[PDB]
Symmetry: C2
Subunit: 376 residues, 2 copies
């Protein structure tokens, strides 16, 4: 439907970061990768073709991404791992008489769309304007791919030199954890192997055009990330109120102001104080809960997204990783500016069924065993 | 070439235990599995076809075994895991227009040959009379399959209830050995809750042509059965007799390192003979033997280090089989005097890459000296 250019990666990652609910990869590593995107030896093209789910019909699709420790990922310059993983998936599809023609980010976040875009440009594929949740999630069963029941394996993990590992999982008949969870439980340790270096490219959930539809119910996530990013980069939204206005009027999203704007205190949680009024946002990577000291129930809970907005001039959106810095352990920029916490209503496919249960389980591990209470 | 019957498994695991250099799986876990070997609902036959390496030409072969925690493994009664892993290999090969006709143990040991034999009878395959070392080994690179460059993956790990995982590894040049990398990934997978610390393993798929080169140490299964039978028929009751038997019947020039002597209570095993003391160091397999009075070890891997308890009854024990309820030892151990015997390594183990693999292992245990063949 449309195409991306190198200059579109900056606003894209910005918007995606805000839709990442605190997780989804740091803008730092996203910028590191985007800085080298330009036609040349490595990238045969400068343009990235992006198609809608209903257009992705001339071949099969696969989810592609980076997985592992951010510390290691923040050092990457080129996406060798993801490119190599997607190539393994393409080769397998070729051996089965099919053509790999599409890649897709697993979730919404600074890295997700960028990685998928770079891989597509590198292999001559098209990236789907969609992802598994419309937000960033701590684990695989929270993505629509898992709910739709797309076989998770063969899964491909790849290094930056040429190391490639394949993983296949067959669960025994129900008598039992989610197959997605099991796969994730086995993939992550493999990346701790010296050959990987705590991170690596991932390629899984290969799909035929038939599976795509039900597998990707949350759509237009890449384009909305780009539209918001452009407005951010252009300085059209410098206040929490302006962010809510933009979301409502331009993206038809009714976000809720959970707290602030207040001051971010020095540090998995981040605290904000508004004069004898404390708010604590709990996160694994992604923010999952927001607590007001004075209330027995949380302000918001996943699947609803929880995102920060730092008012003033400069970077307005940050992932939890991006907030960490050299000042008081906080980024020197955030130190001194008023920050707010915004909740975004989860997209419909996440608000019920297996995905919701998956979220309840994750939250249960974090101590919240109440029901899902839509901010909307 | 020949068939095994249920009554042949006891002798087999006993003789194999002795050629296990202290490791290769416990005799108790091996006995748990063999005790249930009979035609019935699980096994379609009481026979186990065993073939020579140059005789295994009617199809491909694959290494098969149990991997993981001894505590969890010795609780099993049927080789579901290895059987399922072998099955996954057969269908992969079949999907590629090839036939899986054989299985082979990875090493000599109480569990090795027994698991391979039960898998074979279960799936209608034959077991190859050989293993990758002629002894039990601590890690994959010390096996001839690794030295031969047989691709390790696809590797299949299977649980006892239907769980089946596949691992594939393709590396780049110019880093460790692929065997080592594969093992470092295979093991953590088994610690996953779905596996419960252990599992069945099928890897190093081979064509008849690859089999030959990959398996230079041969006749180890029948070699194990031959000794085990001798042990069971009361033909060898002393270390002296054992040394004699190995020489006359198996053409093996063994060496008495220490004893007969008494065992100690509290990975090391100590023996005391009057004023002298011998300590055998082990992970699972015994790797070094020390005499408190000598600055150099009495023996070192690749040479096998094995025990022989004199008297009537059980003469062979893996390090794991010695742990008991008496003084921390097996009730029947303490009362009798035991000896430590070293078996010269098979030629393929005392040279090239496999030798260096043994050196690195030994180094991590403190011994940075060179290999000194007992023979």
């Amino acid at each position: 439907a449309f195409e991306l250019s190198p200059s579109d990666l900056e606003p894209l990652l910005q918007g995606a970061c805000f839709f990442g609910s605190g997780g989804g990869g740091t803008m730092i590593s996203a910028r590191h990768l985007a800085a080298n995107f330009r036609k040349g030896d490595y990238y045969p093209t400068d343009k990235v073709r992006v198609v809608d789910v209903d257009e992705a019909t001339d071949g099969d699709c696969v989810m592609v991404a980076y997985m592992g420790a951010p510390d290691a990922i923040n050092q990457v310059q080129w996406p060798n791992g993801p490119v190599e993983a997607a190539l393994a998936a393409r080769q397998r599809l070729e051996s089965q008489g099919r053509k790999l023609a599409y890649v897709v980010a697993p979730e919404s976040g600074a890295l997700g769309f960028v990685v998928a875009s770079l891989v597509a440009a590198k292999l001559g594929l098209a990236v789907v304007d969609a992802d598994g949740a419309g937000r960033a999630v701590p684990s695989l069963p929270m993505l629509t791919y898992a709910a739709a029941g797309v076989p998770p394996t063969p899964a491909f993990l790849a290094g930056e030199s040429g190391l490639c590992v394949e993983l296949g999982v067959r669960m025994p008949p129900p008598d039992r954890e989610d197959i997605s969870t099991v796969v994730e439980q086995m993939l992550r340790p493999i990346l701790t192997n010296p050959q990987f270096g705590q991170f690596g490219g991932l390629a899984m959930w290969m799909m035929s055009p038939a599976q795509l539809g039900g597998a990707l119910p949350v759509r237009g996530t890449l384009s909305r990330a780009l539209k918001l990013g452009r407005a951010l980069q252009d300085g059209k939204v410098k206040t929490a109120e302006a962010m809510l206005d933009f979301l409502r009027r331009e993206l038809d999203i009714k976000g809720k102001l959970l707290f602030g704007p207040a001051t971010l205190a020095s540090p998995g949680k981040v605290v904000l104080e508004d004069g004898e009024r404390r708010c604590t946002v709990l996160y694994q990577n992604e923010s999952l809960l927001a607590w007001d000291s004075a209330l027995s129930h949380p302000l918001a809970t996943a699947p609803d997204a929880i995102s920060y907005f730092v008012e003033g001039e400069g970077q307005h959106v940050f992932s939890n990783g991006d907030l960490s810095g050299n000042d008081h352990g906080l980024d020197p920029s955030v130190r001194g500016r008023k920050a707010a916490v915004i909740a975004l209503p989860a997209a419909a496919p996440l608000s019920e069924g297996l995905i919701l249960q998956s979220f309840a389980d994750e939250l249960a591990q974090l101590g919240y065993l109440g029901p899902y209470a839509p901010v909307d």
